[PDB]
Symmetry: C3
Subunit: 57 residues, 3 copies
Amino acid sequence: MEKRIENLNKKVDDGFLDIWTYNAELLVLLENERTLDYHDSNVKNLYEKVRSQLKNN
Amino acid sequence: MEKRIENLNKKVDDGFLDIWTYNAELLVLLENERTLDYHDSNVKNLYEKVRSQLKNN
Amino acid sequence: MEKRIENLNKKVDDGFLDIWTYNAELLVLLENERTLDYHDSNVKNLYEKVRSQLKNN
């Protein structure tokens, strides 16, 4: 019998991982082009959010 | 006893809030650098999506 | 009676669609400004992730 709640929890975790992994990859490309300055506290704040989310997943 | 569906609903809402809050913060940094022009209707359309999602959460 | 698991599954699918649609729209604006180079394999990798996610939803 289908474990509906376990499967939906796994779908949410996996989906959140894919979303935060994409956010990390875009942010590293924007920092490499220098679009955003890694020295700026507002940019550091973005980086810390993505990092926090990936370690949590 | 664990309220599994209530807890998974709270996890989804909280996760969506964190994702849309990040989208808003990146978009304001890209508009401040003028990478995207706030005058452009396609950029306004992004802004309205993030705004709609944050008010809904 | 409320179909709680069916409704939470629909909320997750719809939310993921809105998140990946936003990612696609931002990436096309950043490629149009040439912030990111569509010729770069790392940028192609972003594009393929968003594309994969939208076709799956």
